[PDB]
Design a protein around this ligand. Sequence first.
Ligand SMILES: NS(=O)(=O)c1c(F)c(F)c(SCCc2ccc(C(=O)O)cc2)c(F)c1NC1CCCCCCC1
Ligand SMILES: NS(=O)(=O)c1c(F)c(F)c(SCCc2ccc(C(=O)O)cc2)c(F)c1NC1CCCCCCC1
Ligand SMILES: [Zn+2]
Ligand SMILES: [Zn+2]
Lengths: 241, 241
Amino acid sequence: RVSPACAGRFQSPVDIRPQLAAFSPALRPLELLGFQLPPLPELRLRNNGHSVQLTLPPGLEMALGPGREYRALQLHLHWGAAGRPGSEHTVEGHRFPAEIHVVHLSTAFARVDEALGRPGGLAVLAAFLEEGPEENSAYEQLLSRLEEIAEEGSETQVPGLDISALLPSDFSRYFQYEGSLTTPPCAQGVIWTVFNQTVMLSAKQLHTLSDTLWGPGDSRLQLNFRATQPLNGRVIEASFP
Amino acid sequence: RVSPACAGRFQSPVDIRPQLAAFSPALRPLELLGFQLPPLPELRLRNNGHSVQLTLPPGLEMALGPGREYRALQLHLHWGAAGRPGSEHTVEGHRFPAEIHVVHLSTAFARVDEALGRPGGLAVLAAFLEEGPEENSAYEQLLSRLEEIAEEGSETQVPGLDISALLPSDFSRYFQYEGSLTTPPCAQGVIWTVFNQTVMLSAKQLHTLSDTLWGPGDSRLQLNFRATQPLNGRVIEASFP
Ligand SMILES: NS(=O)(=O)c1c(F)c(F)c(SCCc2ccc(C(=O)O)cc2)c(F)c1NC1CCCCCCC1
Ligand SMILES: NS(=O)(=O)c1c(F)c(F)c(SCCc2ccc(C(=O)O)cc2)c(F)c1NC1CCCCCCC1
Ligand SMILES: [Zn+2]
Ligand SMILES: [Zn+2]
């Protein structure tokens, strides 16, 4: 009730139906610069009670295309529980075990509050997390620290790492649509890019993610995804036919 | 010299090469509501020395897509001289006799100065004017008042008119890209939408447009178009296959 933007017509997340997506060959491969960080200075990894977030340093540049430039602010995760998936986006009604969001600010804006609700002011890179056979070493750097931040509102410093190693290797094949933040204030104008390729974590890693953190009260931080929102006439674009 | 933004990477106008345009079926028909203005109140028509400009009232609403809405501010024209075309955009190297620009402000920005340089802050609808056998009634309402404002800096008031009648037939067929103002300050982040189809004016009308107005000094106000700029990797989109 408190935030009217959460009742907007063009909200996220959405159910991606690839057959109804529009092939748009203007959608070129995503470009990331400066994501391969040195170990120092350290970054802050926080259990904010709704997700686990990693705050990103200055100098991480992302482009959705020529002239569509962004700076990375933060990344965070959405996940489920034992035997329950918890991605935000779905594909043909299928929910994936978890989802990573890397949130960026258009280089036309100095602050988030100026970008909120402005077209293209914020851009999110989203990838699904699925079970694979191997321990994912980039994820392990964060997941091995969740026990330190089990309590709601706690944080810890972690060394810099290759942030791009938390995303799929295929930056060419993706869906793109305009939507909203998935937490209040649910501001619209957010460009969502959802990778075709998924990222693989071990079963143990997925369990660590869903079973370690606590939220508000004595409740487990689990199932922290927003319900699917209707496209309401928006057409999802795809970078591939 | 005065405006370094004019040497930016993502400037307008550009040469449109339809075979290299990217078709995206997500580009829906343009929606223009409130454009059928009544005779009163009257509108300001001004020779500002670079173009002739019609100030538009509040209530002219335009959408480039779902939730991507705009309000029209003004329109103005670009033209050549006797036996010389003066459109700004070109199509496969062909320059048309003239070009009309309807400039709009995004409904996420209260002021033009906030929108300048921000992606999608300003949106321009552009149409080519070419020679036809018949006098165009819509354009005559404006062209017949240019003699009154021949001197640089002079202005008059004209009755309200159907602004949409100045535009081409099919609102589903257009090209679109992101670029700049074509005059200082050459601000980037402008969404340009160029109709596929043209509008037709008589040879007398086109002569009236190019031969009536005076600029700065004792110069005729003619050939008021900027040179073609490189795409620099931008891909022009098309709303039709
Ligand atoms: N999917 S999402 O991008 O909308 C998103 C969510 F769905 C989220 F659920 C979250 S976590 C909840 C918001 C929050 C709460 C507390 C704190 C803190 O105490 O430090 C920080 C954040 C979350 F942090 C984000 N992303 C944030 C949204 C906040 C405003 C925009 C800029 C940062 C991205
Ligand atoms: N093609 S374009 O849209 O870039 C464009 C031009 F190429 C133009 F050439 C123009 S006219 C030149 C700018 C100007 C000069 C004086 C006055 C005045 O004293 O009233 C007003 C305007 C012109 F007005 C516009 N459009 C205006 C750009 C300048 C003002 C900021 C944004 C509104 C659109
Ligand atoms: Zn999120
Ligand atoms: Zn213009």
